[PDB]
């Protein structure tokens, strides 16, 4: 037993990380087949980043201006293009460590692992949730851009995120691997505000199931409720509405534990109205919303890749 | 910026994991050079685990009774021995993915990453601290034994932990890679109690430095203190005594932030005497003691491997 925030094993993605240097700027790139994907602001100087005209900066770059290194080996760039906010650098060598992969764009409330990298080398791995306001609570320093987030399904790596920037509130923003930002953010050094965030209700319920499975059962009460009455109570606490799709997604957990979804909703309604009263759940004094139903099932049934 | 519990990149260790099956029991093994290391209770049946005589069970096993698989490839066992609580299986193939490695035995208060595995395949990665009572707060199901914990230093993997069992309180226990348990635990299915735990003071101070670096600065006060007076206050709250070695270990953090170690100790003394009063630090309503000073520096300076 035990329940921990846990990231996917990262080796499949470690074998794809390279360093991308243009002039004086260096960041990370993702090397898949014979293409390196990286944030387009690698072509910026310090002065350009306040309001860059990326199309203009890219015209004055040729293939040889991009120094791509995989460990101690230079990869010769033989082509380049821009796709929204990412650059694609064609190289003369296909990555022999290319895993089976997909590019996906995730929905708010879904989680992924981030492999944080500097200079093309891995530094660490941690789990993140795409917030309803399209930000993530990461840990990124200078040079971390091009670090990617991903999920794994058996042998297939689904890349969903590439890191571009930090917001004044401390949170982080990036793009899918087609270079389209999550959220209303742009890749320039200017103050940008995230929308007001919301608590991912279905993830809180998943976490409460995780808690019951791991012995923490004091918050369960004898009542049921209806979706309508639960959503009425939870709206005032800035919880996103719980849909019937969300209930259906929680179905297998409710079947495994034998606690109906609307009974757990009754328990969460009581927790929202009365607080925890000093008690903890899975060690936390706060309700946690960064575990999806699938993360709970994954960890509590031992799914491997 | 941002501060997250983050694990080491796991690919170096993923390339060493194999499945070890003896009769009807299967668990994980660590394949380094031509030796597979795994928990010795792989040679137990269900009935044996209540009080096993491991030396007796091993005499009736020969090399061929151990089925070692790396992916879809059987590794032929050509030798076997027992070293305390681990088995060493010599195989006719050296692992081509063997990283540079050491076996180390860590001290209470140190952290490591655990790569949780089932059937020789990786499931997830998470960070753990060796508690002062020699347990860890992991997430392990049946079949997880042989999963290892480790640190990475540049290119060298220091293996420090191999998982053997769960305790009635929900916590976990295991051995170093020489098979000596951490703590007063034995590898049999019997009720065993962990010693009463203690809060790792030097790790709390490291985490408070991490908080200051990341904007969370409200708990800083204008006072200093002495090691003696701090330890007097902190003893009653079940905090382990802060030694001068601990202060010296925190030295670089105090230099980077410009906050003296004994000033941060004054801040923590106030936090222990008065609580947090509803406020949080790095998102947590509790004082966190599972980040070492080195984890803080690592994450806040971008150390890669
Ligand atoms: C990638 N290597 C890097 C990652 C960030 C640096 C430190 N932490 C990060 O997450 N990206 C950038 O440095 C860069 C990219 C832009 C999009 C070209 N800029 C920013 O991340 C950034 C930082 C701060 C501000 C800002 C502006 C005004 C304020 F009042 C407050 C903050 C804007 C952009
Ligand atoms: C390894 N594959 C496995 C990992 C544990 C199984 C579930 N979670 C784990 O961490 N090890 C074992 O299953 C096994 C190993 C022994 C040392 C041979 N036993 C235990 O982990 C275990 C579990 C529970 C008790 C126990 C006894 C009495 C009680 F009142 C309460 C609990 C003892 C040993």
XYZ file of C-alpha atoms and ligand atoms in Angstrom:
678
model
C 0.000 0.000 0.000
C 0.890 3.697 0.334
C 0.045 6.503 -2.088
C 2.588 8.878 -3.574
C 2.698 11.435 -6.324
C 4.668 9.412 -8.827
C 6.029 10.200 -12.255
C 6.397 7.898 -15.226
C 9.795 6.235 -15.710
C 11.726 8.750 -17.792
C 14.343 6.713 -19.716
C 12.414 6.641 -22.976
C 12.336 10.443 -22.938
C 15.930 10.828 -21.659
C 17.132 9.100 -24.825
C 15.477 11.871 -26.887
C 16.884 14.984 -25.207
C 19.470 17.134 -27.017
C 21.004 20.583 -26.545
C 20.068 23.276 -29.088
C 22.251 26.375 -29.337
C 21.670 29.329 -31.653
C 24.272 32.074 -31.280
C 24.435 32.746 -27.542
C 21.127 31.091 -26.544
C 20.996 27.447 -25.495
C 17.986 25.385 -24.484
C 16.705 21.813 -24.810
C 15.332 19.953 -27.798
C 13.415 16.729 -28.371
C 15.073 14.470 -30.946
C 12.580 12.094 -32.600
C 13.489 10.252 -35.816
C 15.446 12.859 -37.813
C 13.692 15.932 -36.380
C 14.607 18.058 -33.354
C 11.724 20.019 -31.834
C 12.531 22.992 -29.628
C 11.050 26.345 -28.539
C 11.390 29.031 -31.213
C 12.772 31.630 -28.811
C 16.135 29.841 -29.074
C 16.656 32.255 -31.984
C 16.259 35.290 -29.700
C 18.963 37.340 -28.075
C 18.318 38.959 -24.699
C 17.099 42.157 -26.371
C 14.790 40.332 -28.808
C 12.732 38.710 -26.078
C 10.796 41.846 -25.091
C 8.808 41.815 -28.369
C 10.297 39.414 -30.924
C 9.349 39.149 -34.552
C 10.155 35.441 -34.811
C 9.496 35.180 -38.531
C 11.964 38.010 -39.084
C 14.674 36.488 -36.891
C 14.352 33.116 -38.582
C 15.020 34.472 -42.097
C 18.546 35.492 -41.130
C 19.319 32.020 -39.751
C 20.528 29.172 -41.942
C 20.843 25.490 -41.057
C 24.460 25.852 -39.883
C 23.540 28.541 -37.316
C 21.837 25.816 -35.217
C 24.270 23.791 -33.113
C 22.495 20.594 -32.062
C 24.356 18.276 -29.699
C 23.377 14.817 -28.425
C 25.873 14.181 -25.637
C 29.316 14.699 -27.165
C 28.092 14.366 -30.764
C 27.082 17.231 -33.043
C 24.013 16.501 -35.195
C 24.281 18.309 -38.516
C 21.166 20.378 -39.227
C 19.987 19.896 -42.819
C 16.695 21.741 -42.644
C 14.556 24.023 -40.486
C 10.997 25.308 -40.211
C 8.734 27.003 -37.690
C 5.411 25.496 -36.561
C 3.580 28.005 -34.388
C 5.843 28.467 -31.351
C 8.197 25.538 -31.972
C 11.120 25.094 -34.344
C 11.664 21.853 -36.237
C 15.287 21.178 -37.167
C 15.837 18.363 -39.610
C 19.131 16.569 -38.922
C 21.119 14.027 -40.946
C 20.780 11.282 -38.308
C 17.666 9.539 -37.055
C 17.653 9.028 -33.305
C 18.248 5.284 -32.751
C 16.576 5.626 -29.332
C 13.317 6.973 -30.749
C 10.469 5.320 -28.814
C 7.027 4.721 -30.218
C 5.381 8.085 -29.659
C 2.400 10.348 -30.337
C 1.845 14.098 -30.015
C -1.311 14.810 -28.043
C -2.899 17.971 -26.690
C -4.199 17.313 -23.178
C -7.319 18.757 -21.521
C -7.390 20.778 -18.295
C -7.372 18.469 -15.299
C -5.138 15.845 -16.918
C -1.686 15.096 -15.528
C 1.703 14.307 -17.022
C 5.334 13.865 -16.037
C 7.868 16.591 -16.749
C 11.477 15.621 -17.363
C 13.314 18.826 -16.448
C 16.511 19.282 -18.437
C 19.417 21.734 -18.729
C 21.869 21.760 -21.636
C 20.221 18.693 -23.119
C 20.844 16.622 -19.962
C 18.172 15.418 -17.532
C 17.984 16.959 -14.091
C 14.837 15.526 -12.587
C 11.322 14.193 -13.076
C 8.055 15.237 -11.452
C 4.326 15.041 -11.995
C 2.202 18.047 -13.029
C -1.460 18.763 -13.728
C -2.713 21.031 -16.482
C -4.688 23.574 -14.472
C -8.135 24.785 -15.590
C -6.477 28.165 -16.284
C -3.938 26.364 -18.520
C -0.871 26.784 -16.277
C 1.266 24.212 -14.447
C 3.050 24.277 -11.076
C 6.513 23.228 -12.179
C 10.115 23.807 -11.168
C 12.087 25.433 -13.989
C 15.209 27.608 -14.059
C 16.977 29.386 -16.910
C 17.852 26.955 -19.684
C 14.962 24.571 -18.860
C 12.954 25.516 -21.963
C 12.422 22.611 -24.306
C 11.914 20.289 -21.353
C 8.868 18.171 -22.182
C 5.924 16.630 -20.396
C 4.509 13.262 -21.378
C 2.462 10.214 -20.450
C 3.342 6.598 -21.188
C 0.878 3.932 -22.338
C 2.575 0.502 -22.374
C 5.338 1.237 -24.901
C 4.012 4.484 -26.438
C 5.134 7.904 -25.173
C 2.481 10.605 -25.589
C 4.257 13.968 -25.532
C 1.858 16.688 -24.498
C 3.870 19.663 -23.252
C 6.959 21.696 -24.007
C 8.036 24.361 -21.567
C 8.348 28.012 -22.731
C 7.964 30.484 -19.890
C 7.155 31.481 -16.326
C 4.319 33.792 -15.279
C 4.503 36.531 -12.613
C 2.580 34.375 -10.148
C 5.308 31.708 -10.220
C 3.382 29.237 -12.422
C 4.466 27.950 -15.814
C 3.231 27.941 -19.395
C 4.082 26.087 -22.547
C 2.828 24.548 -25.761
C 1.872 21.196 -27.192
C 4.387 19.639 -29.541
C 2.721 21.496 -32.433
C 3.759 24.737 -30.738
C 0.278 25.955 -29.818
C 0.275 27.406 -26.320
C -1.987 26.077 -23.640
C -3.918 29.120 -22.471
C -3.924 32.731 -23.716
C -0.158 33.155 -23.423
C 2.457 34.280 -25.937
C 6.190 33.630 -25.989
C 7.487 37.101 -25.193
C 8.997 38.656 -22.084
C 6.010 40.694 -20.972
C 3.739 40.566 -17.962
C 0.922 38.097 -18.590
C -1.882 37.097 -16.236
C -3.290 33.620 -15.829
C -7.040 33.254 -15.611
C -8.449 32.580 -12.186
C -7.967 28.896 -11.396
C -10.518 26.263 -10.295
C -10.340 23.036 -8.284
C -10.538 19.873 -10.404
C -13.491 18.146 -8.690
C -13.160 14.735 -10.359
C -9.501 14.635 -9.271
C -10.414 15.364 -5.653
C -12.875 12.468 -5.735
C -10.205 10.188 -7.241
C -7.849 11.196 -4.438
C -10.515 10.448 -1.821
C -10.896 6.950 -3.320
C -7.108 6.601 -3.137
C -7.343 7.582 0.532
C -9.987 4.946 1.301
C -7.922 2.253 -0.447
C -4.946 3.236 1.768
C -6.742 3.125 5.132
C -7.779 6.800 5.461
C -11.546 6.310 5.834
C -12.740 8.727 8.574
C -14.356 11.190 6.152
C -16.866 8.652 4.826
C -20.415 9.380 5.993
C -23.681 7.455 5.806
C -25.354 9.755 3.252
C -25.797 9.912 -0.496
C -26.543 12.937 -2.656
C -27.531 13.914 -6.160
C -25.254 15.371 -8.810
C -27.416 18.516 -8.821
C -27.258 19.137 -5.080
C -23.538 18.386 -4.947
C -22.786 20.853 -7.761
C -24.922 23.486 -6.056
C -22.890 23.145 -2.851
C -19.519 22.900 -4.596
C -19.951 25.923 -6.882
C -19.459 28.381 -4.018
C -16.089 26.791 -3.122
C -14.705 27.336 -6.631
C -14.957 23.650 -7.598
C -15.566 22.928 -11.249
C -18.966 21.347 -11.946
C -19.083 17.566 -11.832
C -20.527 16.154 -15.063
C -21.957 12.719 -15.771
C -18.874 11.950 -17.875
C -16.847 12.582 -14.723
C -19.057 10.173 -12.792
C -18.625 7.546 -15.505
C -14.854 8.053 -15.427
C -14.899 7.433 -11.643
C -17.020 4.297 -12.169
C -14.251 1.671 -11.974
C -12.890 3.175 -8.753
C -16.338 3.123 -7.170
C -16.707 -0.500 -8.249
C -13.301 -1.531 -6.884
C -13.913 0.076 -3.477
C -17.649 -0.560 -3.305
C -18.377 3.120 -2.542
C -20.834 4.719 -4.954
C -19.662 7.893 -6.680
C -22.537 9.943 -5.287
C -21.796 8.673 -1.758
C -18.216 9.910 -2.064
C -19.685 13.174 -3.368
C -21.753 13.356 -0.166
C -18.510 12.887 1.820
C -16.785 15.661 -0.135
C -19.767 17.979 0.336
C -19.432 17.506 4.088
C -15.661 18.112 3.856
C -16.229 21.327 1.909
C -18.851 22.599 4.345
C -17.091 21.657 7.590
C -13.409 21.462 6.786
C -11.153 18.714 8.043
C -11.093 19.797 11.705
C -7.377 19.220 12.176
C -7.442 15.738 10.644
C -5.438 14.818 7.551
C -6.095 12.705 4.466
C -3.102 10.823 3.043
C -0.848 13.108 5.087
C -2.272 16.320 3.590
C -4.243 18.989 5.416
C -5.623 20.205 2.069
C -7.821 18.534 -0.528
C -5.543 17.427 -3.366
C -6.733 17.780 -6.976
C -3.664 16.746 -9.031
C -4.381 12.972 -9.220
C -6.607 11.854 -12.045
C -8.821 8.781 -11.732
C -6.384 7.070 -14.065
C -3.405 8.001 -11.839
C -5.182 6.416 -8.888
C -5.974 3.194 -10.742
C -2.439 3.095 -12.234
C -0.711 3.374 -8.872
C -3.145 1.179 -6.912
C -3.102 -1.705 -9.449
C 0.601 -1.676 -10.429
C 0.499 -0.768 -14.128
C 3.928 -1.059 -15.789
C 5.368 0.068 -19.122
C 11.389 29.130 -10.082
C 8.977 26.754 -8.319
C 9.854 23.920 -5.940
C 8.696 20.343 -6.363
C 9.506 16.987 -4.881
C 11.465 15.600 -7.793
C 13.061 12.245 -8.442
C 16.230 11.477 -10.346
C 15.848 10.523 -14.018
C 15.349 6.764 -13.912
C 16.585 5.456 -17.298
C 19.952 4.280 -16.021
C 18.152 2.109 -13.470
C 15.378 1.012 -15.879
C 18.044 -0.618 -18.043
C 19.032 -2.810 -15.062
C 15.648 -4.206 -14.018
C 14.822 -7.885 -14.634
C 12.133 -10.331 -13.513
C 13.195 -13.134 -11.145
C 10.923 -16.154 -10.772
C 11.530 -19.131 -8.493
C 8.766 -21.736 -8.642
C 5.553 -19.760 -8.175
C 7.083 -16.562 -6.724
C 8.083 -13.672 -8.970
C 9.662 -10.368 -8.008
C 12.184 -7.874 -9.395
C 15.945 -8.086 -9.697
C 18.776 -5.656 -10.385
C 21.043 -6.803 -13.218
C 24.549 -5.306 -12.960
C 27.438 -6.762 -14.981
C 26.821 -10.532 -14.830
C 25.073 -10.565 -11.437
C 21.366 -10.267 -10.613
C 20.591 -9.053 -7.092
C 17.149 -9.738 -5.665
C 15.404 -10.292 -2.308
C 15.991 -13.783 -0.913
C 12.318 -14.393 -0.157
C 11.846 -15.113 -3.877
C 12.658 -18.685 -2.806
C 9.672 -18.782 -0.427
C 6.249 -20.208 -1.059
C 3.223 -18.642 0.624
C 3.517 -21.036 3.570
C 7.268 -20.463 4.020
C 6.910 -16.744 4.620
C 5.552 -17.020 8.174
C 8.939 -18.204 9.523
C 11.334 -19.175 6.724
C 14.627 -20.945 7.121
C 16.219 -19.319 4.074
C 19.449 -21.289 4.250
C 17.405 -24.487 4.219
C 15.247 -23.443 1.266
C 18.271 -22.416 -0.767
C 19.976 -25.834 -0.524
C 17.166 -27.475 -2.478
C 17.426 -24.899 -5.280
C 19.885 -25.235 -8.146
C 20.824 -22.642 -10.759
C 18.130 -23.804 -13.205
C 15.331 -23.266 -10.646
C 15.813 -19.480 -11.062
C 14.086 -18.069 -14.140
C 15.616 -14.659 -14.852
C 14.092 -12.633 -17.680
C 15.218 -9.302 -19.156
C 12.287 -8.288 -21.344
C 11.635 -11.229 -23.664
C 15.063 -12.810 -23.103
C 15.879 -15.506 -20.556
C 19.238 -15.028 -18.804
C 20.764 -18.392 -17.956
C 21.727 -18.594 -14.279
C 25.200 -20.102 -13.848
C 25.681 -19.507 -10.149
C 23.936 -18.419 -6.953
C 24.728 -17.302 -3.415
C 23.045 -15.571 -0.496
C 24.412 -12.367 1.069
C 22.410 -11.548 4.182
C 18.874 -10.906 2.898
C 19.669 -10.710 -0.821
C 20.347 -13.392 -3.413
C 23.070 -12.986 -6.023
C 22.452 -14.921 -9.235
C 25.385 -15.128 -11.592
C 24.228 -15.189 -15.225
C 26.063 -15.966 -18.471
C 25.530 -12.464 -19.908
C 26.822 -9.139 -18.650
C 24.241 -6.377 -18.824
C 25.333 -4.097 -21.703
C 23.347 -1.264 -20.081
C 25.251 -1.435 -16.796
C 25.865 2.157 -15.652
C 28.768 3.225 -13.503
C 27.492 2.397 -10.035
C 28.277 2.040 -6.330
C 26.503 0.311 -3.443
C 26.105 2.684 -0.516
C 24.301 2.468 2.807
C 22.551 5.772 3.497
C 22.027 7.492 6.864
C 18.664 8.452 8.371
C 17.493 11.762 6.964
C 18.950 11.182 3.495
C 16.695 10.891 0.455
C 16.664 8.766 -2.678
C 14.488 7.945 -5.668
C 12.583 4.673 -5.823
C 11.874 3.126 -9.207
C 8.829 0.970 -8.457
C 8.667 -2.120 -10.650
C 6.406 -5.133 -11.249
C 7.478 -8.218 -13.198
C 10.800 -6.604 -14.023
C 9.121 -3.615 -15.723
C 9.068 -0.047 -14.398
C 5.824 1.391 -13.109
C 6.794 4.713 -11.613
C 9.387 6.847 -9.853
C 9.144 8.850 -6.639
C 11.335 10.381 -3.976
C 11.648 8.947 -0.445
C 13.492 9.808 2.759
C 15.060 7.268 5.080
C 13.228 8.029 8.316
C 15.057 8.223 11.665
C 13.224 4.994 12.600
C 14.618 3.381 9.416
C 11.338 3.147 7.466
C 10.212 4.841 4.242
C 6.830 6.163 3.074
C 6.594 4.411 -0.271
C 3.926 3.021 -2.569
C 4.389 -0.719 -3.105
C 1.996 -3.526 -4.039
C 2.502 -7.278 -4.323
C 5.354 -8.082 -6.687
C 7.173 -4.769 -6.034
C 9.974 -6.402 -4.025
C 13.363 -5.978 -5.620
C 12.469 -2.438 -6.638
C 15.479 -0.288 -5.760
C 16.196 3.186 -4.477
C 19.178 5.194 -5.654
C 20.852 8.565 -6.070
C 22.729 9.788 -9.131
C 25.979 11.772 -9.064
C 26.868 12.957 -12.592
C 27.175 9.557 -14.298
C 27.392 7.272 -11.232
C 24.304 5.558 -9.788
C 24.536 4.960 -6.033
C 22.091 2.178 -5.169
C 21.103 2.397 -1.535
C 17.839 0.508 -1.055
C 16.045 -2.648 -2.084
C 12.450 -3.128 -1.054
C 11.453 -6.183 1.055
C 8.308 -5.592 3.078
C 5.511 -3.459 4.484
C 4.906 -2.783 8.180
C 1.509 -2.734 9.942
C 1.544 1.061 10.080
C 1.631 1.284 6.272
C 5.339 2.209 6.018
C 8.019 0.229 4.221
C 11.285 -1.525 5.004
C 14.159 -2.905 3.021
C 17.883 -3.510 2.830
C 20.988 -2.023 1.299
C 22.362 -3.842 -1.713
C 24.416 -6.035 0.644
C 21.127 -7.323 2.052
C 21.429 -5.782 5.514
C 18.102 -4.341 6.606
C 17.735 -0.731 7.550
C 16.280 -0.835 11.048
C 15.507 -3.770 13.367
C 13.380 -5.616 10.815
C 13.559 -9.166 9.478
C 12.218 -10.592 6.233
C 9.381 -12.726 7.560
C 5.613 -12.321 7.563
C 5.157 -11.371 11.196
C 3.974 -8.245 12.947
C 6.896 -5.868 13.430
C 6.864 -2.405 14.986
C 8.846 0.573 13.787
C 10.552 2.713 16.385
C 8.926 6.021 17.144
C 9.862 8.475 14.399
C 11.437 11.955 14.644
C 11.373 15.083 12.477
C 14.565 15.647 10.470
C 15.429 19.188 11.635
C 18.159 19.941 9.084
C 15.729 18.974 6.301
C 13.066 21.349 7.613
C 15.618 24.167 7.570
C 16.630 23.251 4.002
C 12.969 23.375 2.996
C 12.556 26.796 4.623
C 15.522 28.050 2.559
C 13.836 26.575 -0.520
C 10.707 28.513 0.446
C 12.576 31.822 0.746
C 14.240 31.278 -2.647
C 10.755 30.737 -4.160
C 9.082 33.859 -2.742
C 7.557 32.408 0.461
C 9.213 34.731 2.998
C 6.538 35.672 5.591
C 7.926 33.407 8.326
C 11.268 35.222 8.506
C 11.648 37.245 11.707
C 14.183 39.806 12.903
C 15.773 37.577 15.569
C 18.727 35.240 15.856
C 19.257 32.403 18.314
C 21.885 30.003 19.559
C 22.161 26.329 18.689
C 21.653 25.502 22.380
C 18.464 27.512 22.817
C 17.037 26.272 19.524
C 17.647 22.623 20.459
C 16.077 23.208 23.864
C 12.901 24.541 22.235
C 12.808 21.941 19.462
C 13.292 18.872 21.676
C 9.740 19.071 23.029
C 8.295 18.990 19.482
C 10.058 15.714 18.653
C 12.652 17.366 16.390
C 16.026 15.688 16.230
C 18.842 17.776 17.733
C 20.606 20.128 15.349
C 24.368 19.527 15.384
C 27.182 21.762 14.185
C 27.740 19.370 11.271
C 24.144 20.100 10.282
C 24.831 23.830 10.449
C 27.932 23.392 8.293
C 25.925 21.353 5.783
C 23.385 24.218 5.562
C 26.232 26.722 5.088
C 26.079 27.078 1.286
C 22.318 27.657 1.373
C 22.709 30.363 4.005
C 25.412 31.960 1.867
C 23.330 31.841 -1.324
C 20.272 33.419 0.327
C 22.136 35.681 2.736
C 20.141 34.365 5.727
C 22.313 33.013 8.531
C 21.577 29.461 9.657
C 20.853 30.535 13.225
C 18.458 33.241 11.975
C 16.480 30.612 10.072
C 16.579 28.538 13.265
C 15.012 31.511 15.074
C 12.268 31.547 12.400
C 11.645 27.817 12.836
C 11.537 28.180 16.623
C 8.779 30.756 16.211
C 6.960 28.456 13.753
C 7.158 25.562 16.210
C 5.902 27.656 19.119
C 3.105 29.499 17.303
C 2.138 27.338 14.366
C 1.474 28.703 10.914
C -1.830 30.437 11.725
C -3.593 29.319 8.562
C -0.753 30.391 6.268
C 1.111 27.954 4.030
C 4.740 27.486 3.018
C 5.353 26.239 -0.530
C 1.706 25.163 -0.653
C 1.953 22.973 2.466
C 0.199 23.537 5.774
C 2.772 21.286 7.478
C 6.519 21.612 7.938
C 8.156 19.321 5.381
C 11.250 17.314 6.364
C 11.904 15.118 3.290
C 14.164 17.552 1.351
C 17.835 17.416 2.185
C 20.061 20.478 1.856
C 21.532 18.797 -1.197
C 18.061 18.293 -2.746
C 17.392 22.002 -2.325
C 20.680 23.056 -3.913
C 20.254 20.457 -6.704
C 16.802 21.674 -7.691
C 17.468 25.405 -7.213
C 20.732 25.417 -9.237
C 19.782 22.998 -12.051
C 22.189 20.091 -11.527
C 22.028 17.544 -14.372
C 23.356 14.014 -14.855
C 13.375 28.767 -20.872
N 14.563 28.375 -21.010
C 12.902 29.915 -19.961
C 12.256 29.298 -18.704
C 11.900 30.362 -17.655
C 13.174 31.080 -17.115
C 13.111 31.036 -15.565
N 11.960 30.167 -15.258
C 11.269 29.777 -16.404
O 10.289 29.045 -16.358
N 12.047 30.887 -20.702
C 12.351 32.278 -20.587
O 13.295 32.615 -19.896
C 11.613 33.438 -21.340
C 10.874 32.944 -22.551
C 10.081 34.028 -23.259
C 8.691 33.512 -23.573
C 10.783 34.477 -24.563
N 10.834 34.311 -20.445
C 10.078 34.102 -19.281
O 9.940 32.978 -18.816
C 9.489 35.290 -18.524
C 9.840 35.595 -17.200
C 9.334 36.715 -16.509
C 8.464 37.676 -17.100
C 7.902 38.851 -16.361
C 7.597 40.109 -16.951
C 7.060 41.165 -16.210
C 6.814 41.006 -14.833
F 6.304 41.981 -14.115
C 7.097 39.792 -14.223
C 7.624 38.757 -14.983
C 8.125 37.373 -18.447
C 8.629 36.246 -19.133
C 7.416 -7.797 -2.169
N 7.169 -8.222 -3.328
C 6.397 -7.651 -1.024
C 6.034 -6.158 -0.890
C 4.898 -5.927 0.117
C 3.572 -6.600 -0.352
C 2.453 -5.529 -0.271
N 3.154 -4.271 0.041
C 4.518 -4.464 0.261
O 5.274 -3.539 0.522
N 6.881 -8.301 0.229
C 5.996 -9.187 0.915
O 4.887 -9.382 0.451
C 6.346 -10.011 2.201
C 7.829 -10.163 2.387
C 8.207 -10.887 3.667
C 9.318 -10.129 4.365
C 8.661 -12.339 3.378
N 5.609 -9.568 3.396
C 5.171 -8.324 3.877
O 5.418 -7.293 3.264
C 4.303 -8.246 5.130
C 3.000 -7.724 5.118
C 2.175 -7.690 6.261
C 2.558 -8.228 7.524
C 1.697 -8.167 8.747
C 1.682 -9.147 9.777
C 0.864 -9.028 10.904
C 0.012 -7.916 11.041
F -0.762 -7.776 12.092
C 0.001 -6.936 10.056
C 0.828 -7.077 8.950
C 3.872 -8.771 7.526
C 4.697 -8.798 6.381
